[PDB]
């Protein structure tokens, strides 16, 4: 902290892919109300695209937004599958009323009107319908629709008539409609019609004009209609009479509108005949007419300026499916007549490739000349928000990358660098003249260079939407973006730095390993981590599903770290797998061991590496899934160092840490979820010989467990069900007073089981993410970056979590300066590495060693992404920011003159004394 806000740290707030959006607002209100797939309800500034008020929710589906509506100035939302309905004041940025609802799967939501004004909400669940007041949310009336045990309701309609229309269908069979009254709610009427060809109502059918139901029928290429106000039998109109046809293997849709719930719907509506094809149809008393046909158009949208409806149609400049260049034009068409608006065409280009717009929400207003001026928020396929304004300059207003809401993996890449003695002297003196000339002469990804302290790196981020980003670690800006086509949401990623920027003759090179979960096939993408472009080195095609990957420290000739993959057939594939690489890893084969942790079966296997690139069953253990399921397999970071091999115990003696570099820390939960019988096991299984160093099982405890594994110790936070309190438990591994094998450490040559020191602390809050502070040489003290749900980042000193803290202080403890054991761990607000930059729904904390020895770079990723530096040792090796230059220089240059003056004084006094 130290009140130097914004000097080094930066936070970016990211919401997820925009599931539901609302643009309709006052022209001066300049607000967007959006609920995303991340359970987040937020308000975006229309002008610049910034958060006004953001309300995240539970990450699980138990707070998922299911339906949004806007009325006047407050937005009404439904969450938890219709369980709760809330009203949010868009201006203040808070709730207005929160009401829980009854059981039953929600199917349709709508509003009702008495005579001219909407005042109640009609919410329909698969078995019932409910009315709630707008003023307070009080339930008006609940009616169980008849026969609903068989029908599935799909829509709700009401308008100024003071009645409620309910519609339900049964697949490939008859459908039913119910008339309720807003005043009471009783079943005013009920009708049923036969729809043998119908599948579902919401996706296919629609309702236009005066509640007239319209189902597009692709079986007969027609438009089945039912004048729902009066008609009791569906009518049919073929599209051939209107010169229209449906696509093959597609579900045509119908898009009506309703400028305000009180009035009836507009007669005109859209029909999605086939993909890249739309029609405008105007229903008028049993017959319909084609207003305008839009071929090769991706997305259409409707808007109302208050009196007239406006349709926005999206298509690229010239089709080449796909589109020639990602240049999409949106045109305005009046809804009263299928006529394109004048001077309203917008044209933009999508930066990425393989990405096409997915969602389009437009907001309209009256210009000075009464011309419909509109803006368009378009979400692409790769979860990117673009705000397009009509005026040509800056055709995009604010481009928001919501995709970065869900980051899977990220890495920090260093920036690029900025025989005879006579020959040596000649070149050295030449260099001297060159440097002298350079000094005397002193009288953006293009120029990217490494800092002096290496404190400014570049973060290569991977997003489950399959998107790769390059973000400057200092400013947080994006330097390069790439997209991976066809990446499933649940795919597993793995990013590896094959070659850093310290090899100027060779390009930097990183490898990302993705693995589709459903198929099992894994692929390797090699790219320059600085520029983001795929390397020309074609990665091998991983034919078989793979299980694990290793980044061997051995490097190819071009300083590319060898990467090994173990496939499903337990074979090993190398990369680059050249002759030199093949020889090196074939010659060093028996010293390479894989461990595969099958969590489903509770099995651990450890395989050797044969000379001929084959694996053999070296060791195998089985934790029975019937009583224990593996939940964490946290091993120690490979890229860390230990400064002090042993520790001073006082007494002028040393206690040796048990530095096992092949030590797993497999943490498993108890399959018994009872609050009194649950337990959490931690096994310190070795990674080579498979030996379980320790097999601790904490009783009466429950997950989730957040474990950090470091040089020697492990720290795993958990929940204690017996006392209902989050608890830590530090396990420190210590060897004897004298080291067993020094020169080198081998997991096959450790017959002495290391002693374990344990201690359980109480944490007075929850947790969201943990990660130890890592330094280049490990000299700087270790800190745990506790991630609280609140968003803060506690910097807990590891020295506090010592298990050797005695319960009663003694002379040995005082000599060693050991604090007496205190089961309570403080959450002092002064320890947070962030002040108020809370990272809502924190997902992980990345710690980078950086340069120097006191500064560790921190990137907390979750919904928001925040970056800073931490000084676990108070930045001991850097000049203080409050140095008194004007004092040191002043004393120096007021003391040199003092020295001169006092020398003169001494001379004068000596002369006078000599002469007397």
């Amino acid at each position: 902290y130290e009140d130097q806000v914004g000097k080094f740290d930066w936070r970016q707030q990211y919401v997820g892919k925009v599931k539901f959006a609302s643009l309709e607002f006052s022209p001066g209100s300049k607000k967007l109300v959006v609920a995303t797939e991340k359970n987040v309800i937020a308000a975006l500034n229309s002008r610049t695209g910034e958060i006004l008020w953001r309300h995240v929710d539970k990450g699980t589906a138990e707070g998922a937004v299911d339906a949004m509506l806007l009325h006047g100035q407050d937005v009404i939302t439904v969450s938890n599958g219709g369980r709760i309905m809330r009203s949010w004041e868009t201006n203040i940025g808070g709730l207005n009323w929160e009401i829980t609802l009854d059981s039953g799967s929600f199917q349709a939501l709508g509003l009702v009107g008495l005579q001219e004004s909407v005042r109640y909400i009609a919410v329909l669940k698969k078995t019932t319908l409910a009315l709630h007041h707008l003023s307070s949310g009080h339930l008006k009336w609940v009616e169980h629709l008849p026969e609903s045990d068989s029908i599935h309701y799909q829509m709700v309609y009401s308008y100024g008539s003071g009645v409620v229309w309910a519609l339900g269908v049964v697949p490939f069979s008859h459908v039913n409609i119910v008339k309720f009254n807003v005043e009471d709610g009783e079943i005013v009427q009920q009708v049923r019609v036969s729809t043998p060809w119908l599948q579902h109502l919401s996706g296919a059918c629609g309702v236009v004009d005066e509640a007239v139901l319209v189902c597009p029928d692709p079986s007969s290429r027609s438009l089945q209609t039912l004048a729902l106000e009066t008609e009791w039998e569906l009518r049919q109109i073929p599209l051939q009479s209107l010169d229209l046809e449906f696509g093959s293997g597609f579900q045509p849709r119908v898009l009506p509108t309703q400028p305000n719930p009180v009035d009836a719907s507009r007669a005109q509506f859209f029909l999605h005949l086939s993909p890249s094809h739309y029609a405008l149809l105007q229903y008028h008393y049993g017959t319909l007419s084609l207003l305008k046909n839009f071929p090769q158009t991706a997305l259409v949208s409707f808007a109302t300026t208050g009196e007239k409806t406006v349709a926005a149609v999206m298509a690229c400049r010239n089709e080449v499916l796909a589109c020639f260049n990602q240049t999409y034009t949106i045109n305005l068409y009046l809804v009263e007549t299928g006529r394109r608006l004048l001077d309203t065409t917008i044209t933009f280009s999508l930066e990425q490739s393989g990405t096409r717009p997915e969602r389009l929400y437009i907001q309209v207003f009256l210009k000075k000349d009464d011309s419909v001026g509109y803006r368009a928020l378009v979400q692409t396929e790769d979860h990117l928000l673009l705000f397009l304004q009509q005026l040509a300059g800056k055709v995009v207003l604010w481009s928001r990358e919501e995709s970065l809401a869900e980051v899977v993996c990220l890495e920090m890449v260093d920036l690029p660098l900025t025989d005879g003695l006579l020959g040596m002297f000649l070149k050295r003196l030449s260099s001297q003249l060159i440097l002298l000339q350079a000094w005397t002469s002193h009288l953006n990804i293009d120029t990217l260079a490494r800092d002096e302290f290496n404190l400014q790196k570049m973060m290569v981020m991977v997003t489950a939407s399959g998107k790769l980003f390059g973000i400057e670690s200092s400013s947080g800006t994006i330097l390069w973006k790439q997209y991976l086509p066809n990446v499933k949401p649940d795919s597993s990623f793995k990013l590896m730095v094959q070659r850093t920027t310290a090899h100027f003759p060779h390009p930097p090179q990183c490898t990302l390993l993705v693995k589709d979960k459903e198929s099992g096939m894994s692929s390797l993408y090699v790219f320059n981590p600085i520029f983001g472009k795929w390397s020309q080195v074609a990665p091998p095609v991983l034919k078989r599903p793979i299980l694990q990957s290793l980044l061997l420290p051995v490097m190819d000739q071009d300083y590319a770290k060898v990467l090994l993959l173990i496939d499903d057939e337990y074979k090993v594939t190398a990369f680059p797998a050249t002759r030199n690489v093949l020889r090196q890893l074939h010659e060093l084969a028996p010293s390479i061991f894989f461990y595969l942790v099958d969590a489903e079966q509770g099995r651990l296997c450890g395989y050797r590496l044969r000379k001929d690139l084959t694996t053999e069953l070296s060791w195998e253990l089985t934790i029975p899934p019937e009583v224990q399921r593996i939940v964490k397999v946290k091993g120690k970071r490979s890229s860390e160092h230990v400064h002090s091999q042993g520790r001073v115990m006082g007494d002028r003696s040393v206690l040796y840490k048990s530095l096992n570099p092949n030590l797993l820390a497999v943490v498993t939960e108890s399959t018994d979820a009872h609050h009194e019988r649950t337990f959490i096991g931690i096994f310190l299984i070795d990674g080579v010989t498979g030996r379980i160093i320790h097999s601790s099982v904490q009783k009466k405890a429950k997950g989730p467990v957040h474990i950090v594994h470091s040089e020697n110790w492990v720290v795993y936070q958990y929940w204690n069900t017996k006392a209902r309190r989050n608890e830590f438990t530090v396990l420190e591994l210590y060897e004897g007073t004298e080291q067993y094998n020094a020169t080198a450490f081998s997991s096959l040559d450790r017959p002495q089981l290391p002693q374990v020191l344990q201690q359980s602390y109480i944490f007075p809050s929850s947790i969201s993410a943990m990660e130890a502070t890592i330094t280049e040489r490990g000299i700087t003290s270790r800190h745990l970056l506790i991630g609280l749900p609140s968003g803060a980042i506690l910097s807990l000193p590891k020295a506090l979590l010592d298990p050797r803290r005695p319960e009663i202080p003694t002379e040995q403890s005082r000599e060693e300066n050991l604090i007496p054991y205190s089961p309570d761990v403080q959450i002092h607000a002064e320890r947070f590495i962030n002040y108020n930059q809370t990272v809502s729904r924190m997902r992980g904390i990345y710690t980078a060693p950086s340069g120097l020895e006191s500064t560790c770079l921190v990137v907390a990723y979750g919904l928001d992404i925040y970056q800073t530096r931490v000084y676990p040792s108070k930045q001991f090796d850097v000049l203080k920011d409050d140095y008194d230059y004007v004092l040191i220089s002043s004393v120096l240059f007021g003391l040199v003159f003092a020295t001169m003056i006092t020398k003169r004084l001494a001379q004068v006094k000596l002369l006078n004394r000599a002469w007397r």
Binding site: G778, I779, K874, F876, L895, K903
Partner: protein, 225 residues
Amino acid sequence: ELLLDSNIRLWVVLPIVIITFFVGMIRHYVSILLQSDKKLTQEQVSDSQVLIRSRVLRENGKYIPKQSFLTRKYYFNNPEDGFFKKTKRDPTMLTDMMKGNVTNVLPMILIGGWINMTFSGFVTTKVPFPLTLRFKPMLQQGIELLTLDASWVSSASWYFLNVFGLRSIYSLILGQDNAADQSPADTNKAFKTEWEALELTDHQWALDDVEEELMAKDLHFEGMF
């Protein structure tokens, strides 16, 4: 190793050296400026010079024949002659001398303390030899590290080493036996001890054998030109 900040050199290493150098010069110059000779009356200087003559006589009366020497002895320490017998006789000075003695080290320690406060929290230099771990609490004042090598030193001990290594330089440039470093009242007893010493002394006329030791070798004469 450690990538130390370059600015630690330009603002914490060199300024310490400059400060030490010029503080030594200032201290020496202030010392010579402050020194004022105390007024001495005729009697004290007279008796000091008299005992000086007596002692130099005791030292080298060998180049004087025996009778002259024993006449000197009679004059100095002998009842009949009378000499050496009828020859005898918070305060500001203590505070002044105590302050003068104190100002040779205490200013250095105060400067060290001021530097320790001013330059607390740094790592100035790495001592190129492996110091013991037990010296850590004082070499690395202002550093929170635990596993840091003892060879890394804070500002205070670096200043101490600087002030330790500059006395020879002071003698080199300022002049020999400079005052920038770190480190008779009673005549009656003096009269009696001179009495006893010159009583104990004997005579050996060194000229008793000069001629014989001169006749042995010819007189040096070259270089007459």
